[PDB]
């Protein structure tokens, strides 16, 4: 493996199913090369905002490590996957640092994730005691006691379950349709550069 390999970006952008945003998936990309032209010359993307790197320039740069974070969110919630943004997703589900270096890629996935009758497999976290630190993942499903009475592990009056389904139907508005999101994090540290363009 320590001898010139192709970065397995396929199992990220092209996976059959994505993870819910509260349990966002992360794959570490290391020691490999990739032709980023196939990425920035693709028209299948509705959001391709880069921060700190020029998109069309990814083949001319090398990086120590690359992190690909992937999940599914609502359409109107895509704008929160950006440095300095706040909201339900940025505060409680997935948060980018103010100094983020990388690109935020998103495309409509109603054809892949919506079902007549509603697809409720994708969820998000409604609340959290404090906002998420950058690149922090919270998968806790503990029922919160917001009242006087102990909850004993069941939903109730002031006994809330921290996660809720999205409810994806094919007839929802675009702003309410599922969108698949990939967050590429390029790390240029003091280590030797491994993930290069070509």
């Amino acid at each position, epitope marked *: 493996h320590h001898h*010139t390999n*192709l970065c397995p970006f*396929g199992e990220v952008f092209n996976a059959t199913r994505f993870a819910s945003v509260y349990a966002w998936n992360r794959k570490r990309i290391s020691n490999c090369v990739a032709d980023y*032209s196939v990425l920035y010359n693709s028209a299948s993307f509705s959001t391709f905002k880069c921060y700190g790197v020029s998109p069309t320039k990814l083949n001319d740069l090398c990086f120590t490590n690359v992190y690909a974070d992937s999940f599914v969110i609502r359409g109107d919630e895509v704008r929160q996957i950006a440095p300095g943004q706040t909201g339900k997703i940025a505060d409680y589900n997935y948060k980018l640092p103010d100094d983020f270096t990388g690109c935020v890629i998103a495309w409509n996935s109603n054809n892949l994730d919506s079902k007549v009758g509603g697809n409720y497999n994708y969820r998000y976290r409604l609340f959290r005691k404090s906002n998420l630190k950058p690149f922090e993942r919270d998968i806790s499903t503990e029922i919160y006691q917001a009242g006087s009475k102990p909850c004993n592990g069941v939903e109730g009056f002031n006994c809330y379950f921290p996660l809720q389904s999205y409810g994806f139907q094919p007839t929802n508005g675009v702003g309410y349709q599922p969108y698949r999101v990939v967050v590429l994090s390029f790390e240029l540290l003091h280590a030797p550069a491994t993930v290069c363009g070509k």
Partner: antibody
Amino acid sequence: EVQLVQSGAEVKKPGSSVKVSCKASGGTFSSSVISWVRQAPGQGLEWMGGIIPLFGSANYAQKFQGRVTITADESTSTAYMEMTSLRSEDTAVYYCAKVSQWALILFWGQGTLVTVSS
Amino acid sequence: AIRMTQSPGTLSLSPGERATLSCRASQSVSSSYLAWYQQKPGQAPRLLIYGASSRATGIPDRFSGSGSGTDFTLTISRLEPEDFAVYYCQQYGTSPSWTFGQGTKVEIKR
């Protein structure tokens, strides 16, 4: 857009060699794993080997390590499979299969019939 | 080398039944690089499933792939006349190192 086009069917006599081509279009050529799959009549699918055009480092199955050579030409986006010392047991259909590093789907050619006899 | 052994060799069922085909791996295989193919006689292999569970273009919903690690499963919820064929599973990846299963023939019952 992506499409694999292999060369026409051939008839080789025993002892000779054959070099099957595989023309790819769509730009995903250099950043792909392009393999060659063989199917003898009445048998299953058999993976012979593959190569990554960016590196040119081909890998081969043990059964085909000796008489099979797989090359790649990034200038024309064409893969080649050359088998020497052809025997009647090498009569089969030969497919070039390709996986782009940006997807999990497999791209196949239409196959090439090689009949070995005199 | 990784070995893909399918089970059963032959599957004798009637139209309308549920087909359950097995693909066993000698090592743990990433579910992102497993495929299923349908082959009718005299035809090139038809890519059914890629990435363990993604359906290729035009494949009906009655074909579903599943599994992980070493046990992978192709299920046909209701067999049509056109589905009786031979089915192969393939391990692959981003490296030139792929293997195929020996295949499973789905034929009709009498």
